[PDB]
Amino acid sequence: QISVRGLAGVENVTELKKNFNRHLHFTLVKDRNVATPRDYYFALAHTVRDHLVGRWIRTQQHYYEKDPKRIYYLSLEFYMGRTLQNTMVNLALENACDEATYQLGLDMEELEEIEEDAGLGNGGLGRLAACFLDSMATLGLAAYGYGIRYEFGIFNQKICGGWQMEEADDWLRYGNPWEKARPEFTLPVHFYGRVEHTSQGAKWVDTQVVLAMPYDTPVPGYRNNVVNTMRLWSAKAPNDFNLGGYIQAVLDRNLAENISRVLYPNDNFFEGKELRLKQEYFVVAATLQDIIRRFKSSTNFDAFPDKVAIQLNDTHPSLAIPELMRVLVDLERLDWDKAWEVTVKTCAYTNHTVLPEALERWPVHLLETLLPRHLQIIYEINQRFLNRVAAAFPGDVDRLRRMSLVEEGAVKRINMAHLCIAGSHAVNGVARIHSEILKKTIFKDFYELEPHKFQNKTNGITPRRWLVLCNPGLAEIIAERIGEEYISDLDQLRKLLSYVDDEAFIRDVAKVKQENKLKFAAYLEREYKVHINPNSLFDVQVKRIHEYKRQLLNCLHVITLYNRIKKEPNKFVVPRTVMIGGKAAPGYHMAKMIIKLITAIGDVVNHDPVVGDRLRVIFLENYRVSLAEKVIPAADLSEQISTAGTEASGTGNMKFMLNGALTIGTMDGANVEMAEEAGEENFFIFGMRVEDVDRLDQRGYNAQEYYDRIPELRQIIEQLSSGFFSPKQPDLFKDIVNMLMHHDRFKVFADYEEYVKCQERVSALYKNPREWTRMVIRNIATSGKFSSDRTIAQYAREIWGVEPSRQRLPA
Amino acid sequence: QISVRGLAGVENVTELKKNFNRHLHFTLVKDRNVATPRDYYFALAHTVRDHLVGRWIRTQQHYYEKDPKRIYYLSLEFYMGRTLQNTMVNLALENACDEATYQLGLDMEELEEIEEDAGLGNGGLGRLAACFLDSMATLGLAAYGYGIRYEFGIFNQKICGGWQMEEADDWLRYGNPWEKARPEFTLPVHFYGRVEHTSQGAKWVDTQVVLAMPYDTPVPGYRNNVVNTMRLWSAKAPNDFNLGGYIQAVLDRNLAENISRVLYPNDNFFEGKELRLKQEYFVVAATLQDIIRRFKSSTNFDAFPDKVAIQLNDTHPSLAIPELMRVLVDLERLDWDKAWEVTVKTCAYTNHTVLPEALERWPVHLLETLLPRHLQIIYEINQRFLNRVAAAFPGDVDRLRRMSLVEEGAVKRINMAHLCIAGSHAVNGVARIHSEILKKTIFKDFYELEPHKFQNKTNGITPRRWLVLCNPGLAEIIAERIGEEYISDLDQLRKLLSYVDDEAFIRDVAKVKQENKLKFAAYLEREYKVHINPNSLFDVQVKRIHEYKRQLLNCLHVITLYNRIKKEPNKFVVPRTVMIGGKAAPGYHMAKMIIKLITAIGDVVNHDPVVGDRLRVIFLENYRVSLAEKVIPAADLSEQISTAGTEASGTGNMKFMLNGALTIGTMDGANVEMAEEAGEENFFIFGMRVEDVDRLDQRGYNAQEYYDRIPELRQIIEQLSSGFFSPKQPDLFKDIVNMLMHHDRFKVFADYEEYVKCQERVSALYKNPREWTRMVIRNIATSGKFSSDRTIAQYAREIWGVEPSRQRLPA
Ligand SMILES: COc1ccc(/C=N/NC(=S)N[C@@H]2O[C@H](CO)[C@@H](O)[C@H](O)[C@H]2O)cc1
Ligand SMILES: COc1ccc(/C=N/NC(=S)N[C@@H]2O[C@H](CO)[C@@H](O)[C@H](O)[C@H]2O)cc1
Ligand SMILES: COc1ccc(/C=N/NC(=S)N[C@@H]2O[C@H](CO)[C@@H](O)[C@H](O)[C@H]2O)cc1
Ligand SMILES: COc1ccc(/C=N/NC(=S)N[C@@H]2O[C@H](CO)[C@@H](O)[C@H](O)[C@H]2O)cc1
């Protein structure tokens, strides 16, 4: 049907049809009389995956023969979403499969909806890993993603009586066609035990063993025939484990296997839970053995950093540093100084937040019991590091305690971020402002000691998933004017600037958005029985629920609009559909209250006859990658409204920009760079800058001052307090009011006035569809910088020391 | 190479080779450079299983169109062993696959050794289920085996310092190519809760739910294109199960899923363990819903018994009786009397033991908590049943308490055997003598009330696995003379009687045995580094370790032989290799002591220079189906030496008879019928008959009497007591001596003299190879009755009311 989806040739269509029928029969053991829609999905998935196999084998064979430097991306999260459409896109098979299935009497889009998301992440950090894997494959890098195969990913969110309920994400229930178990590469991982010091160095003995079994998932590059590997480890008990008493011993195998059972969803507050520590070591120990094995199958560890790069995605896999030291010193018998040099040159660390409560600070007593040898290595690293600090800054005793890897206090803790900086040759933030904040504030001491280590690598998103896949209509009208090359060279979108006055293009851009909005309005009614006005402005805020992200500020605006309508009912206002979605971490009470507030506002607003279809508030249940692919193309206004200095980058922001929504946002994270690329005139910027926040903190933030001077704000607080939004439980939102009034770390009131005024300017522009669309074109045209291909090319050149390549492998 | 293995045609060989290469590539993601032997096994398994699919779909389609009466064989055990060779045999693909793999540069026998046994059973009862499935498919019956998919089957046995150690049988570790998950037929199973009595009858409410997910395994008939199904249930938690606290709730899902985790190995002593009760209900509840669903997809439950037979394999699935009543009365709203009539006509029960400690007697308090509605139904069944007894035998109050389903005492218990008799239209024992013992002793009261219910169905074994597969050399020399028809009509082996004087045949039979012995002697040295004399008499006792099976009596003979050699070292004796193997239930202390005794005897005997190669004692580690397939063809003498009246049938006995070993045995179980078929002159019968045992019990068994009057026996006991077989732990075997002397339920001493004398007659015959072989021929020629095809034809005609068919389905 559409060009960017590839050719539907006679030979390929015929072959796809026959292979589909083969899989239905031999693989699924069904015929057409008894086959369920799920059977049809699986037959298609097997048919498509068959096309990856040869490319996968020859890519890995190529890496073996050429022996390039390998890149190992270590993450506890890979938020992959669905794989079927993405594989078709990268193989240029979409139109062929669409045709093939159509001729078989099936709707391929319906089949695509059957696939479970691989929800092996929480949000931004996990999705970044996934975009990065796509870009590394597209850029021809010899890259491997290494993580954990969680049996249960991020919970499915149900809303019951306006409240979040969590249910297990049993994503493997029906089997996963995208993985290949590799039990031949099973590796032992050690826990507990004790350290013996012999004449021949230290030895870690009397350990408990858990097996790490790898599962390989292909990562196809965009039409370059490259297929990289994501290897995820699963925990398995050894067969003599714990071996009535016999029955119990077999049942107890579960304890070992619990390591890979479930993804921790607490992205708000570091919890020093032993199981989480075990997960972190498990991935690191298995991965490092695999890396070392591959390196030896090329004695001379001097060449190790020439052949190996390890990227630590936050501090979660920070134990790689002392683990690499452990293997090099205890097992390979390298001297300390040489092992350290190798380690530093091998490892690099990416920081993803500045919020203190998210920083990993592991109790020493936990490490002492679980990983006794690693603790000793960490102490030794600390001593040698602090000796360097003392030599560089003689007599600066407070610097010594500030920089120590060991934090003294009630319970002694290890600061894993300090470990990561000490043991890495490169440390990067994820947007220019975030990287500057790292140098100026939280890692200032480290920057002063080793300024060469600190870099910026502004985040990006893959334009394959986040344009071609989710928004084929937009991809097509762009390709009609400028060709297909931009899909792997997103900077080419700049060429669209010469179409900003083009009447045909203006019309096409606006038409594609309208279609997307119609499609999404239909999705809502079908799957959720909720009815919306497709001519309204689609105002969307989707991302995890956090106080810093200020879904609450959005709520205040919504109530402001409702109150203004109720005050002057017969005045014209631009109709809006306000959509808010995202999961709250299960133990984060305030985030759970915020969800309940949003639904409670919806309950009042959506049933007020005077409002009509002029304002609708919808909570988007179970926000996840597959839902983002639907709502993002449909959005007009992207809400990116974190308090300046709190959102390290954001990546949702980039997705909306690429898909033709305008942005209302603070100068925070990557928003700054987005406004810089597009021009401030083409962005709806409001609110305190980082400097204004700092000024307010020095003086002291007094919320009462705002409450006292802003009558519209006072009214909303009175409504919340008195039970206007909770008639039967008048005090339901007392926690929210109290927080806003007395302990708001994120200064919701301070940005309220500017935000509301900025929103008025949004409504003004939307009244003029032609000027709205021209500004949209200026956003899409300047979104090129935010391709993860650019991001990965920078990591490659500036951190890993490898050159990317757009050259095809032979097919 | 050999004819009974089928044709190796050019077209088939070429196609097998290409499909093997296809699977290696697309299914296993390997090429020949990196492929492991396990990869080659899997490629072959996938290649073979492809040939089953069409036949499987059309068999099940055939059953749907013809709607024959369906047979449901309910068992907690299916001891299947390996599937690859068996599938090739039944599809006539063996020679073709051998050729195909040979041309690919692979040894197929080596590939076959890679497959794990499906060890989903303990011994005889589990293996019987497996032989029955093979025969039902071969006889064209619309039969389904229903059981549990244990994650862990019977433990692997390791011998460490002469002691049994158990390790988990993680048989699914590498995946199972012989199953297809069927998550679309997932069913809820209910536990706990309480009963409410409404106006509209009883209701079972507030239950906990566990999901039952089925996995289907094909059961191919012998060259008739029939492929039946074995459906095994796996336990899955529902997604809202139990839904920090979030993490724990996900981890707790294990509790629900533990139901199908492990096979109970305690075949010696009934343990009223709650988990075992849950397993029993789980299989019954899921199976009955599946049966009812299939029946409705044909209101009128009068036709239910015309379309459904349920065979209960022992009492383990006895809850089918009250479960069927529950569904019929509570859910379908049938009146009690009609529901009962349907139930009785549907269910039949097979008893497999008379040992009182093996009988299931569930504590009432367990059923009350776990299955409150079933307890009430059981009480009601009991009341109505006892009302019938009281009417038939007025005033016989002791009969009432003897026959009650409820046993009064310390803890009230339900006698599940009594439940099974009451609720079944047929009750059968498994050999003629066992069935007679049931009528005369343990179920005498029930027989008097309902004599028409009691039947015999003598056990059998499948001649596919137990001749063609394991002993192709023997199958071939038989086929050379009498054709191939005997493989599915084993009575045809009678034709071999006319070859008992045939010099060529005598030579061939003896040659095949010698080859088998050479092959097994080689297997031992390669896999276990143990060295044996292949010219010795192979004296084998393999079966689970139990006091009633009297491995101890065999031990006494072994020591007798050793002592006689030591007394007259320069006298000629027929060399023997005595092999004993079998697993002991983990909590069965005496059985564990017996294993240690056997190894301890081996330790003395095998290293005595005076003995030489004249006597060797070997403990066969990890006896299982795949090992039986190796040792049985190699055996000369089959030890079947249970105390008369204790072995219900035995089936190992039949395997040895079919494979050219002579039998030394008591007149117990099927041994009686074997001797009757072959002629007593062609069997080595010794020892007390059942009547002699009864006579001894009335008088009182005094072991001391034997010790006092038999000097050779006294010497052995003195040796055991003094520490001759345990120098460093002189009292190691004190438990064994004490048991033999003071509390031997199985009268080991009473059969000692006759056994030793009988063994002398065995040695005498073996000195004359020509006469040994002629007697062997007379055994093989009369083994026909013991085909499970005969057994199943009798169940079909006399219990299920269906006619078997040898007619091919079209291919
Ligand atoms: C290119 O992409 C792929 C990925 C996998 C394969 C081959 N895969 N081949 C097997 S046998 N895959 C198995 O499938 C099962 C699902 O039924 C999983 O449960 C199991 O973990 C997986 O190892 C082939 C190509
Ligand atoms: C215990 O379980 C967890 C789970 C998650 C976390 C931390 N999760 N951390 C995230 S999701 N960090 C995000 O990273 C994105 C990519 O750079 C940025 O765009 C974004 O600004 C930043 O907030 C911490 C602990
Ligand atoms: C005739 O005999 C058969 C049996 C099965 C099939 C098809 N089977 N097709 C699938 S996808 N089998 C899966 O394979 C996995 C092993 O990798 C198992 O873990 C899983 O339980 C099983 O459902 C086809 C024919
Ligand atoms: C708790 O776990 C268990 C496991 C097994 C059992 C009982 N297991 N019962 C057996 S294996 N019974 C055997 O049946 C064979 C077939 O008819 C007969 O040939 C044989 O004589 C008889 O002993 C009981 C409880």
PDB file of N, CA and C in Angstrom, chain B residues 33-76:
ATOM      1  N   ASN B  33      29.701 -26.158  11.859  1.00  0.00           N
ATOM      2  CA  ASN B  33      30.985 -25.766  12.452  1.00  0.00           C
ATOM      3  C   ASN B  33      30.899 -25.598  13.958  1.00  0.00           C
ATOM      4  N   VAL B  34      29.704 -25.276  14.438  1.00  0.00           N
ATOM      5  CA  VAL B  34      29.514 -24.944  15.844  1.00  0.00           C
ATOM      6  C   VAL B  34      28.511 -25.874  16.537  1.00  0.00           C
ATOM      7  N   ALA B  35      27.929 -26.798  15.777  1.00  0.00           N
ATOM      8  CA  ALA B  35      26.893 -27.690  16.299  1.00  0.00           C
ATOM      9  C   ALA B  35      27.466 -28.720  17.266  1.00  0.00           C
ATOM     10  N   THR B  36      26.800 -28.852  18.410  1.00  0.00           N
ATOM     11  CA  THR B  36      27.159 -29.823  19.437  1.00  0.00           C
ATOM     12  C   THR B  36      26.390 -31.116  19.159  1.00  0.00           C
ATOM     13  N   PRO B  37      26.832 -32.249  19.740  1.00  0.00           N
ATOM     14  CA  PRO B  37      26.066 -33.492  19.577  1.00  0.00           C
ATOM     15  C   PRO B  37      24.592 -33.358  19.981  1.00  0.00           C
ATOM     16  N   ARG B  38      24.313 -32.534  20.988  1.00  0.00           N
ATOM     17  CA  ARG B  38      22.943 -32.286  21.434  1.00  0.00           C
ATOM     18  C   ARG B  38      22.130 -31.579  20.348  1.00  0.00           C
ATOM     19  N   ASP B  39      22.751 -30.620  19.659  1.00  0.00           N
ATOM     20  CA  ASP B  39      22.122 -29.976  18.507  1.00  0.00           C
ATOM     21  C   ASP B  39      21.718 -31.000  17.453  1.00  0.00           C
ATOM     22  N   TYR B  40      22.590 -31.975  17.201  1.00  0.00           N
ATOM     23  CA  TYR B  40      22.308 -33.013  16.217  1.00  0.00           C
ATOM     24  C   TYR B  40      21.140 -33.887  16.646  1.00  0.00           C
ATOM     25  N   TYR B  41      21.100 -34.251  17.928  1.00  0.00           N
ATOM     26  CA  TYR B  41      19.950 -34.977  18.458  1.00  0.00           C
ATOM     27  C   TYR B  41      18.646 -34.210  18.210  1.00  0.00           C
ATOM     28  N   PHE B  42      18.638 -32.920  18.550  1.00  0.00           N
ATOM     29  CA  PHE B  42      17.439 -32.106  18.391  1.00  0.00           C
ATOM     30  C   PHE B  42      16.997 -31.949  16.946  1.00  0.00           C
ATOM     31  N   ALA B  43      17.958 -31.777  16.040  1.00  0.00           N
ATOM     32  CA  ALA B  43      17.637 -31.664  14.620  1.00  0.00           C
ATOM     33  C   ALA B  43      16.953 -32.960  14.163  1.00  0.00           C
ATOM     34  N   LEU B  44      17.478 -34.098  14.605  1.00  0.00           N
ATOM     35  CA  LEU B  44      16.878 -35.394  14.256  1.00  0.00           C
ATOM     36  C   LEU B  44      15.481 -35.555  14.855  1.00  0.00           C
ATOM     37  N   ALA B  45      15.324 -35.206  16.137  1.00  0.00           N
ATOM     38  CA  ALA B  45      14.014 -35.283  16.795  1.00  0.00           C
ATOM     39  C   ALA B  45      12.952 -34.434  16.098  1.00  0.00           C
ATOM     40  N   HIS B  46      13.312 -33.203  15.742  1.00  0.00           N
ATOM     41  CA  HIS B  46      12.397 -32.338  15.007  1.00  0.00           C
ATOM     42  C   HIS B  46      12.068 -32.938  13.642  1.00  0.00           C
ATOM     43  N   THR B  47      13.067 -33.539  13.005  1.00  0.00           N
ATOM     44  CA  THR B  47      12.886 -34.136  11.668  1.00  0.00           C
ATOM     45  C   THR B  47      11.881 -35.293  11.735  1.00  0.00           C
ATOM     46  N   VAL B  48      12.031 -36.141  12.748  1.00  0.00           N
ATOM     47  CA  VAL B  48      11.135 -37.280  12.960  1.00  0.00           C
ATOM     48  C   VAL B  48       9.733 -36.834  13.384  1.00  0.00           C
ATOM     49  N   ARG B  49       9.666 -35.894  14.326  1.00  0.00           N
ATOM     50  CA  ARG B  49       8.382 -35.461  14.815  1.00  0.00           C
ATOM     51  C   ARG B  49       7.551 -34.815  13.724  1.00  0.00           C
ATOM     52  N   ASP B  50       8.203 -34.188  12.740  1.00  0.00           N
ATOM     53  CA  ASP B  50       7.477 -33.641  11.584  1.00  0.00           C
ATOM     54  C   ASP B  50       6.573 -34.695  10.924  1.00  0.00           C
ATOM     55  N   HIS B  51       7.038 -35.934  10.906  1.00  0.00           N
ATOM     56  CA  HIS B  51       6.297 -37.039  10.287  1.00  0.00           C
ATOM     57  C   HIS B  51       5.053 -37.456  11.055  1.00  0.00           C
ATOM     58  N   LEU B  52       5.008 -37.119  12.339  1.00  0.00           N
ATOM     59  CA  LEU B  52       3.831 -37.417  13.141  1.00  0.00           C
ATOM     60  C   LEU B  52       2.673 -36.446  12.955  1.00  0.00           C
ATOM     61  N   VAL B  53       2.963 -35.209  12.544  1.00  0.00           N
ATOM     62  CA  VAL B  53       1.963 -34.132  12.666  1.00  0.00           C
ATOM     63  C   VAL B  53       0.679 -34.372  11.874  1.00  0.00           C
ATOM     64  N   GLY B  54       0.815 -34.734  10.597  1.00  0.00           N
ATOM     65  CA  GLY B  54      -0.361 -34.948   9.756  1.00  0.00           C
ATOM     66  C   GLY B  54      -1.234 -36.072  10.282  1.00  0.00           C
ATOM     67  N   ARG B  55      -0.595 -37.181  10.652  1.00  0.00           N
ATOM     68  CA  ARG B  55      -1.275 -38.346  11.240  1.00  0.00           C
ATOM     69  C   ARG B  55      -1.970 -37.988  12.559  1.00  0.00           C
ATOM     70  N   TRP B  56      -1.307 -37.172  13.378  1.00  0.00           N
ATOM     71  CA  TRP B  56      -1.890 -36.690  14.626  1.00  0.00           C
ATOM     72  C   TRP B  56      -3.157 -35.858  14.408  1.00  0.00           C
ATOM     73  N   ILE B  57      -3.092 -34.888  13.499  1.00  0.00           N
ATOM     74  CA  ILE B  57      -4.254 -34.057  13.182  1.00  0.00           C
ATOM     75  C   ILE B  57      -5.388 -34.905  12.592  1.00  0.00           C
ATOM     76  N   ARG B  58      -5.067 -35.803  11.670  1.00  0.00           N
ATOM     77  CA  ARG B  58      -6.143 -36.578  11.062  1.00  0.00           C
ATOM     78  C   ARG B  58      -6.722 -37.660  11.974  1.00  0.00           C
ATOM     79  N   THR B  59      -5.910 -38.207  12.875  1.00  0.00           N
ATOM     80  CA  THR B  59      -6.455 -39.138  13.871  1.00  0.00           C
ATOM     81  C   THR B  59      -7.503 -38.423  14.737  1.00  0.00           C
ATOM     82  N   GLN B  60      -7.135 -37.262  15.277  1.00  0.00           N
ATOM     83  CA  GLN B  60      -8.045 -36.518  16.148  1.00  0.00           C
ATOM     84  C   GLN B  60      -9.282 -36.025  15.398  1.00  0.00           C
ATOM     85  N   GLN B  61      -9.109 -35.649  14.135  1.00  0.00           N
ATOM     86  CA  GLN B  61     -10.233 -35.291  13.263  1.00  0.00           C
ATOM     87  C   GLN B  61     -11.158 -36.500  13.038  1.00  0.00           C
ATOM     88  N   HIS B  62     -10.564 -37.662  12.785  1.00  0.00           N
ATOM     89  CA  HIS B  62     -11.304 -38.915  12.640  1.00  0.00           C
ATOM     90  C   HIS B  62     -12.184 -39.195  13.867  1.00  0.00           C
ATOM     91  N   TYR B  63     -11.614 -39.074  15.070  1.00  0.00           N
ATOM     92  CA  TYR B  63     -12.388 -39.281  16.302  1.00  0.00           C
ATOM     93  C   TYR B  63     -13.558 -38.311  16.427  1.00  0.00           C
ATOM     94  N   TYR B  64     -13.356 -37.077  15.983  1.00  0.00           N
ATOM     95  CA  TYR B  64     -14.427 -36.089  16.012  1.00  0.00           C
ATOM     96  C   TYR B  64     -15.585 -36.455  15.065  1.00  0.00           C
ATOM     97  N   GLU B  65     -15.260 -36.938  13.868  1.00  0.00           N
ATOM     98  CA  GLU B  65     -16.282 -37.272  12.864  1.00  0.00           C
ATOM     99  C   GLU B  65     -17.014 -38.578  13.167  1.00  0.00           C
ATOM    100  N   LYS B  66     -16.277 -39.599  13.600  1.00  0.00           N
ATOM    101  CA  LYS B  66     -16.872 -40.896  13.921  1.00  0.00           C
ATOM    102  C   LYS B  66     -17.473 -40.968  15.324  1.00  0.00           C
ATOM    103  N   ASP B  67     -17.024 -40.075  16.208  1.00  0.00           N
ATOM    104  CA  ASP B  67     -17.491 -40.006  17.597  1.00  0.00           C
ATOM    105  C   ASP B  67     -17.518 -41.361  18.321  1.00  0.00           C
ATOM    106  N   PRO B  68     -16.383 -42.091  18.339  1.00  0.00           N
ATOM    107  CA  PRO B  68     -16.442 -43.373  19.039  1.00  0.00           C
ATOM    108  C   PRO B  68     -16.441 -43.149  20.550  1.00  0.00           C
ATOM    109  N   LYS B  69     -16.744 -44.187  21.317  1.00  0.00           N
ATOM    110  CA  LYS B  69     -16.573 -44.110  22.762  1.00  0.00           C
ATOM    111  C   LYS B  69     -15.102 -43.809  23.072  1.00  0.00           C
ATOM    112  N   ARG B  70     -14.867 -42.829  23.936  1.00  0.00           N
ATOM    113  CA  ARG B  70     -13.508 -42.458  24.303  1.00  0.00           C
ATOM    114  C   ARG B  70     -13.068 -43.109  25.599  1.00  0.00           C
ATOM    115  N   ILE B  71     -11.798 -43.498  25.646  1.00  0.00           N
ATOM    116  CA  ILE B  71     -11.203 -44.140  26.814  1.00  0.00           C
ATOM    117  C   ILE B  71     -10.238 -43.151  27.454  1.00  0.00           C
ATOM    118  N   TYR B  72     -10.458 -42.865  28.736  1.00  0.00           N
ATOM    119  CA  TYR B  72      -9.587 -41.947  29.470  1.00  0.00           C
ATOM    120  C   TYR B  72      -8.841 -42.714  30.548  1.00  0.00           C
ATOM    121  N   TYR B  73      -7.531 -42.825  30.366  1.00  0.00           N
ATOM    122  CA  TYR B  73      -6.689 -43.554  31.288  1.00  0.00           C
ATOM    123  C   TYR B  73      -6.031 -42.559  32.244  1.00  0.00           C
ATOM    124  N   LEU B  74      -6.533 -42.506  33.472  1.00  0.00           N
ATOM    125  CA  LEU B  74      -6.057 -41.549  34.465  1.00  0.00           C
ATOM    126  C   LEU B  74      -4.978 -42.175  35.314  1.00  0.00           C
ATOM    127  N   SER B  75      -3.809 -41.551  35.317  1.00  0.00           N
ATOM    128  CA  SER B  75      -2.692 -42.057  36.099  1.00  0.00           C
ATOM    129  C   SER B  75      -1.856 -40.894  36.607  1.00  0.00           C
ATOM    130  N   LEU B  76      -1.278 -41.050  37.798  1.00  0.00           N
ATOM    131  CA  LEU B  76      -0.342 -40.051  38.297  1.00  0.00           C
ATOM    132  C   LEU B  76       1.061 -40.318  37.794  1.00  0.00           C
TER     133      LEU B  76
END
